[PDB]
Every structure is written in C-alpha cells, then in structure tokens.
Design a protein around this ligand. Structure first.
Ligand SMILES: *[C@](O)(c1cnn(C(CC)CC)c1)C(F)F
Ligand SMILES: *[C@](O)(c1cnn(C(CC)CC)c1)C(F)F
Ligand SMILES: *[C@@H]1O[C@H](CO)[C@@H](O)[C@H](O)[C@H]1NC(C)=O
Ligand SMILES: *[C@@H]1O[C@H](CO)[C@@H](O)[C@H](O)[C@H]1NC(C)=O
Ligand SMILES: *[C@@H]1O[C@H](CO)[C@@H](O)[C@H](O)[C@H]1NC(C)=O
Ligand SMILES: [Cl-]
Lengths: 537, 537
C-alpha cells in the first residue's frame, strides 16, 4: 500500500515526498480540486462542489493562480515580484494544498492559510507561503486554498447571477472539504486554526461571523486585518455602481434597469480584460471589488455583529506591524515617496499629502488630523513628517481596526493575544526608512529564515523558530505560551478588555505594552467621528 | 562711623544686624519709604516720590502690608496662612526692604523680589520670603518691595484719577529707588536681577517690556508666570465695567458718563470695604483687577510687543511646576476637590468639571479638551480624571504661557534657561494627591530648609543650596551653571529656539527634556484657536 495515495470523498489522489529546506521530509498534495471550474456560465456565481473522478489524480504540481493584475510598477524588484503570481493564471483555479509531517500524525492540529492581497491579487502558491518548514518544525498539517479575487470573486449586482462574495463562498467550500477529508491526511478536523494576513485576515474574521462557517473551524489568527477596516466591505449600493462602471469600461450594456444584459455580456469578456479595467478614481486603501453584506454569507455588517455579540466564541491571536501605511503610500504617492534611500518629506509636502490621503473629510477634520500627526517637539523635521504619513494611514486603515476587533472579542469573555511586530530583516530590499512594513512577519511565520541559502542571520533564524512556536502553540492549545517558562520564549500575556496588553515581537526584546497606540486609535474611533458630526451643517 | 546708618538720597536711615536662621549674620533695613503714602486724594493714582526727612529714620521694623482680603477658607491650615499678611494692613504700605551680607560687599549683585498673589493679595514681609538665608548663603544684596494690590492698585476707568496700573508704577518707582541708592548698601546698581513668582513673575515680565523700566535692571527670573497668560491683563473696556460694578456694589454712583462722580465716592470708602467687594461671577484663574494697556507703562499688548521684538534684550531664567492647576481648583471646585486625603474624580464628574473650568468655549471646543485630557490607556480611572483637571488648568493658565515667553526670548537671540520643578517636600501639609503645586519652589529659592527649627531633611537642605546657587549664579553672571562642572550641580543647558531643552529640578535627578509639555501647549496655542474660529458661525 502506497501512503502517498489518499482516497478523498471524490476520488483517489497521489502526492509526493519532498525535503524541507530544514533537512526533514514532508508529504505533499498540491492542487487538489474542491469545486467545479467556475468558468462559462458559472463566472461570478457561487462555487459548485467538485465532481467525482475515477482513477488516481496526480496532485504533485502547484496549482494555477486565479486571474489578477500583475504588478509591474517596479519591474523585477524582489520586494514586488515576491507577491506576483508564480504559476499560470486561469479561471480554473479552485484548488487546495495539503502538507503533512513525517512520520504522518494521527490527529494533528491543522493550520489553514488564507492569503491576502487586497481582495484583487494573491495566490496560495507563492514561495513566501511555502508550507514545508512550518509543518515539519511544528508537527501540524498545513493547508492552503485558492479563492477567486477581483471582480471575478466579488462582483455584486443584487441579482442571482451576480450575488456577491463568490470568493468567500469559495473559502467556505474549501473549509467544508477540509472537515470532510483532513483526517485522511492525519489531521484532526476539530482542530482547524484559520490564519491569514491582510485581506486574508479580513476573510478569517468574516468566517468568525458567518453562520455558514461557524462549525467549520476551531480558532483564528489574524495578521494586520480586521472586518471593521474601511476597505474591508463596500455597501451594496456602491458595489452595484462599481460593477456597472466596470461593464461600461469594457463596452457592455450598463443600465441599472436591465442587469441581465450586463451580466451576460460580462460573462463573455476575456478575464484579463475584466481585472485590468477595475481601477477608476479610488483613494488610498480603497479596493474596487471586496465583500458585501449579501444575505447568506453575511446578513448584517460586521460592526452590527460585533455590537450584538453575534460572533464565534473562541480564542484569537492578532496583531499589527509598526509601519502599516508606507507600502500603500509608496504605490499611491509615487512622486512623494520614491523607492530610494534617504527620502524625507517637507512640512509643506506633508500638509498637501494629508489632503490627498483623507480626501473625504472637511477642513476642520483635516486640521485635527494635522494636529494629531505633527511631532510638536520638532514640527518641521522632514523625517517626522514622512513617518507621520505612514502612521496616519496605518492607524486608520490597519492598527486601529485590529485593536477594535480584539477589544470586542475580549469584552465578550474570549481569550485574546495581541502582538506588535517590530523586526526588520537585515536583508530587507526596500529603503531603510520604510521600517517594518505591512506583511513583513509572513517570512518569519512560514520559517523562510530556516532556508540556509537565503541570507538570514542566526538570530533571525532563532526569531523565526520562536514565532512558529507561538503560532503553533496557539493553534494546538489556544495559548501561544509553552508549559515550562523559557528564557527564549517570553511570557505572552492575554489581551484583556480592560488591560489591553500586547507583546512586542522582535529580536532583542520582550517588552509588554498596552494597545498598541491607544491614543491615536481613540482619535480615529471616537474624536474624529464626533467632530465630523458637529461640523456637517 | 556707624556702618548701619546709611545716607539715602532722601535722608539718613538706621538698620540693624541680625542672624539668619542658620546663625550667619546679615545687616538689615526694613521699611524704607519710597513714595508718599497713597492715601486720601492720592488713592488709585500713580505714586509720588517720598519727601526728604531730617534726622535718622530707624528702618528696623517690617512694614505694613497693603490692604487685601485675608484668606480664611481653611481656617488655621498652615498651607493657606503662610500666604496671609503677617504685618498690619494699611494703605500706608509703599516701603522697600534691603538685606546685605556680612562683611558688607562693595559691588555685589542685587536680587530684587516682586511677590505674587494674583494681583489682589501678597506682601513682601511673608516669613517664607525671609531674605536672610539667601543674602548670607550666596553673597548677594536681597531687596523686596511692597506695591498696591487689588482695586487699590489696579482700578481703571480711563480717566486721569483712575488711570490704571498704580501697582506697576509703584514697582517702577521702587526700581528707581534701588538704582539711585543700592550702592550705599554694597550693591552694584548695574547688576539688579528682578525675580518674582506668579503675578510677581508677570510683573517682572512687564518690566521687560515697559519703556519706563528698560534701563532700571539687568536681567530677570520668572517663576510660573508670563505676560501672555489669560489672567495677566484685562482689556480697557472690561476693566472699566469691573470698576463700575465695584462702585455699584459699595453704594457709589456708577454712570459711564460721569466717571468723576464714581471715583470721588470710591475715594471716600473704607479700603477694606473696597477689596472685599470685588468678587463677582468670575471663572477659575480670573482676577478682577489686574494690569491694563494704559498708554504710559505699556502702550501695546504684551503679545504685540513679543511679535515685534520690542522687549529688553537680556538673559532670562524661567520655569514651571508639575501641578500648576490644583491650588486654584481646590479653591474653585470646593465640593469636587475637597482638601482631604484620597480624593478621586469619576468620569462623569470630569466631564462636568471640563465645562465649569472652560465656561466660555462652545460644544466642539469642550469635546476637544476632553479628548486631549483623557487617559486613553484607562479612560475612566478616577485618579487619571483628577490629574487631568490639574493638567488642563495648569497648561492653559500657566505652563504654556511660560513656554511661549521663553520661546520668543530665545528666537530673538537671548540666552534662556528653563526648569521644570518636580520636588514635593516631605513636610508638605496639603493632601498627597496635590503633588508639586504652584508656589512650592519658593521655600527652596529662599533657603527655608536651612532653618534648623524646621523639619526639612538633609537631602532637602542640599537641594535648597543647589537651587539658591543656580539662581544667584544666574543673577551674578547670566548663567546658572558654575565654572567647575560638579556631580552635585548638573549641567543646565540653554533653552534654544529649536531645542527647547529644560532641566528637571528635583532631589535625585538631572534629567533634561524638551518643553515641557510641547504637545499640550500646541493644543492650547495652535489647535484650539483654529478650531474655535472654524465653528463659531
Ligand atoms: C492586504 O490584503 C494586503 C495587500 N498586500 N499585502 C502583503 C502581501 C499579500 C504585502 C504588503 C497584504 C490588503 F492590505 F488589504
Ligand atoms: C499668582 O500670583 C499666585 C497666587 N498664589 N500664589 C502662591 C504664593 C503667593 C500660592 C499658590 C501665586 C497668581 F496665580 F497669579
Ligand atoms: C501519475 O503518476 C504515475 C507515476 O507515479 C504515472 O505512471 C501516471 O501516468 C500519472 N498519471 C498521469 C495522468 O499522468
Ligand atoms: C539587548 O539589549 C541590552 C539592553 O541594554 C543591550 O545591553 C544588549 O547589547 C542588546 N543586544 C543587542 C542589541 O544585540
Ligand atoms: C532710633 O534709635 C535710637 C537708638 O539707637 C533711639 O535713640 C531713637 O530714639 C530711635 N527713634 C527715633 C525716632 O530716632
Ligand atoms: Cl451568533
């Protein structure tokens, strides 16, 4: 009997044994189908489960990537190409990958990754997500899934043929596949931890809300993403207009009264033409096709679920990086924050950037933003004015929403663990002033430093082991801390509703603070909303 | 020849040799007259110089205190009685005191004290201002003066018989006495340092502006007071109304069209009746009779003098205490901050106090104050909400105005030295939660801890020696620092226009910071004014 052949509920599949960069071996099944290819009449619609197959399906090749724009702003710059699809683009992209340790466990914990990329880009096949180190160093089953992105995943028109949230229904079906099958690979289907970063963390958090996902997993890890972020959802009314704008841009009928004509034309267009025409006039951290409240995956806004306690009762581990904003500013204000060493921002340039980065608020609100994000020890310092741009974008779009989500989870009696990730890799290829950007922790979570052919220092290898241990301790037990307190593994205290402690994740540190950034988060969540109310005569 | 007999430009006077509390001996001349008694028809009017006398005037008794209200709110509480007059009250109060070291110097530096008390109270004769320790420990001539306070010193009606600023003309006349006479006591009249606290510091700063005082002294020390403070001046129009309200309250004619009738009745009233009827409906840190812009002592507001550079070019030493607000809140919100141990403030009480303590600003401004003065780590903490009250009163009325004055001076090329005084005496009789209040540094500046009948620790005696040494070094040279760097005398760096360094004055500390409190001061001086303008349709 061949242990690399596995009989799934739809047929048999064949995997392959491979090496970790770690020296240990793992078994691997790449490209398991979990839905019918969502092509032809099935475009924009919810996935159908996969049809049974006879024989043994060879699942040994990384699957196709879902159709998406390719980023060429910086050419072959490694900081950018690491996030571009590394497998062929196709609408036939609904696949799962499974990676098991050796020897195969019986009832191991299962860590299921959901990638980010602003709901219009990303793929489970990226080298930075390679599953082998995490599985073999921590003895967990590691799973990843594809889901449709961009208008192909999130077109909404309020009609049955464009119902919204297709990409979320994709993730739900993959979750169902895992519960029905992961025990055949040595995983315990009652010990599934979802983890994701960015739009993948939003996705995870939406599974903490949906009644369709409630019983499909055990706990959740959310890296730099929360469902209260202003980019995480779009109203149904605005989604309908963006879809019609897309129909216009590609030459289709676009009348609000005959939505049948628009969907049918859109189903005939080339998929690359669709994703390449989504980009109208949108501000920073505004993505055109994202989740909506549809009635079935969600039937109320996340903030209404949070206010009422209608969310899954379980532990969560979540956090932010210190420079969440720069990445998006680098791609949005391409004249101001050039990708070069030694960039600084003048006070006059800062005052203009504030208007460009918060284009919807009135003058009085802009003044408050300026006051809140000025270094009053040295108001004109050109480093301070550059950093202030990162902090106002990162606080509003990322950090403060993570805080809000963790706070409501803790108030309802759930164990919460909060981190602030502060480590900058020695080999970071971005300019020195960018600090610790959005996404930097992913390399350490997946154990890339344990690949000796990359350039990581010995200390960074140790740091990556610590982080994989915290993450997988959390997946296995609900608590990232080990049993015997260690000098290498500082105590990570709970994030309580009143205390709001967080652990700083970095090389030479075990600092525990509160928040992070409680005062700036109160500015966005409490002060600025009431000032906008008072001044909207 | 009798060294205690001195021939002043108006006659001979006889002093007396006495011991400082430490046992060192000083020569002393108490109660030297420098003006005609401002009585009868001379009430409210500028002082006339004193008439010559034949003989030897014995100047050995502490002089009368100017008429003022006596504070009985807390009975015999020593924290309050230390500020009440300790000599008989009289309108005949225009006197100077001189205290010289032994042996007598030839050309010593002269430190000239101007007392505070909100321009309605105070006297040079208070035991806490006793001059003997400072003169004898530091080898300086110490001079103090009386000046008229309250309506007797600052009544203004815009007529020649109530022209305003009588108390300021009193101080100026005393300055002219010191320049004409102090060399006969061993002082160098080209080495007069003015120093003052609170309203005495405002007074000092106004001598830095007035053309009448410009050549009368060399440099200035300003403890917790600045001419840009909101209580430091009153408009001419509002002063006129307050004078007319006082005339009504005591039964006098009060018609804006016949001011002669109002002044003449006021001149016939008992002086105690006048000072006891000044207190209408005024908010915290609002004092009824204070300096005005008169045309002769000042002919433009202090902020216009500062903006244009029209002020004396010289060194200044200035600073603030950590709890500037509490003293005034204790006397204003007598139900909320009872003078007991263990006082705290609830969030609901804090929100009400913000309105009572800033009664002139609109809804949007109060919101901003609340946001600026909330501890967002723990918004409802009853200690944090009490401390927030001190800080918002202290920032607006004291600390931020000292910062503004020191900043202007430094921008114009003058050497500035800034302190933050943080020492709470072991024997402080106020409740523990009051911290380091307004006025606390005065005991140490005058060397009270060196009095062996009092209860100060040895550490406090050393601290007082240090503070006297800085103050007198500054008077002697313009620099508080000694020549040989010491372990007991940390470096006190200049407060430059862009560095804004300050030295923390405390027991076991030499911390150097910036500001202090630059962010909160920017809130009051920059953000809140532009928010008030935007929201007053
Ligand atoms: C989130 O999905 C996101 C966008 N880019 N990233 C990383 C790697 C995918 C690189 C910054 C995450 C988006 F912010 F919502
Ligand atoms: C200032 O003159 C003042 C009022 N009281 N004090 C001290 C000692 C006189 C006691 C707190 C100073 C006033 F604030 F303007
Ligand atoms: C699957 O792999 C086996 C060898 O392991 C091979 O013989 C077979 O042809 C493969 N199937 C397909 C469809 O290529
Ligand atoms: C870690 O921090 C301590 C704190 O002073 C320091 O002494 C030590 O050298 C640091 N090690 C580093 C930065 O590698
Ligand atoms: C002043 O002092 C002397 C004693 O030294 C005394 O004789 C004289 O009477 C006193 N009084 C006056 C008014 O001079
Ligand atoms: Cl629920």
């Amino acid at each position: 009997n061949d242990p690399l052949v596995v009989n799934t509920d739809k047929g048999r599949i064949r995997g392959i044994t491979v090496d970790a960069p770690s020296g240990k071996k793992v078994d691997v099944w790449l490209g398991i189908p979990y839905a019918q290819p969502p092509v032809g009449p099935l475009r924009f619609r919810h996935p159908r489960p996969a049809e049974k197959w006879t024989g043994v399906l060879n699942t040994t090749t990384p699957p196709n990537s879902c159709v998406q724009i390719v980023d060429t702003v910086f050419g072959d710059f490694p900081g950018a190409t690491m996030w571009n699809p590394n497998t062929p683009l196709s609408e036939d992209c609904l696949y799962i990958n499974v990676v098991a340790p050796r020897p195969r466990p019986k009832n191991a914990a299962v860590m299921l990754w959901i990638f980010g990329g602003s709901f219009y880009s990303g793929t489970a096949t990226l080298d930075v997500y390679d599953h082998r180190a995490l599985a073999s160093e921590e003895n967990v089953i590691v799973v990843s899934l594809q889901y449709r992105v961009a208008s192909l995943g999130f077109l909404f028109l309020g009609t049955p043929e464009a119902p919204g949230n297709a990409g979320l229904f994709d993730q739900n079906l993959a979750l169902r596949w895992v519960r029905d099958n992961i025990h055949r690979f040595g995983g315990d289907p009652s010990r599934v931890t979802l983890f994701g970063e960015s739009a993948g963390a939003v996705s995870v958090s939406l599974h903490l809300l949906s009644a369709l996902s409630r019983d499909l997993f055990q706990r959740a890890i959310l890296q730099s993403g929360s469902p209260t972020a202003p980019w995480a959802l779009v109203s149904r009314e605005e989604a309908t207009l963006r879809a019609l704008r897309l129909a216009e841009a590609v030459g289709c009928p676009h009348e609000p009264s005959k939505l049948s004509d628009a969907v049918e034309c859109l189903r005939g267009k080339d998929p690359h033409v669709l994703v390449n025409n989504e980009w109208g006039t949108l501000g920073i951290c505004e993505f055109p096709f994202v989740p909506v409240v549809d009635g079935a995956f969600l039937d109320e806004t996340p903030q209404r679920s949070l206010a009422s306690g209608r969310f899954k009762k379980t532990e969560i581990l979540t956090g932010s990086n210190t420079e969440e904003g720069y990445y998006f500013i680098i791609y949005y204000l391409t004249e101001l924050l050039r990708k070069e060493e030694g960039v600084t921002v003048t006070r006059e340039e800062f005052l203009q950037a504030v208007r460009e980065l918060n284009p919807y608020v009135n003058g009085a609100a802009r003044q408050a933003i300026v006051f809140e994000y000025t270094d009053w020890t040295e108001p004109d310092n050109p480093n301070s004015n550059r950093d202030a741009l990162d902090k106002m974008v990162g606080d509003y779009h990322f950090t403060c929403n993570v805080n809000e989500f963790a706070q409501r989870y803790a108030e309802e009696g759930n164990n919460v663990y909060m981190y602030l990730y502060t480590h900058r890799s020695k080999g970071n290829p971005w300019p020195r002033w960018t600090g610790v950007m959005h996404g930097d922790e992913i390399n350490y979570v997946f154990g890339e430093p344990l690949n000796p052919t990359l350039g990581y220092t010995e200390d960074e290898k140790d740091f990556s082991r610590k982080i994989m241990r915290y993450w997988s301790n959390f997946a296995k037990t609900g608590n990232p801390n080990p049993n015997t307190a260690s000098s290498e593994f500082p105590e990570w205290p709970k994030h309580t509703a009143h205390g709001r402690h967080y652990l700083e994740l970095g090389l030479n540190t075990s600092f525990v603070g509160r928040g992070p950034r409680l005062r700036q988060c109160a500015f966005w969540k409490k002060y600025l909303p009431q000032l906008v109310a008072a001044t909207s005569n």
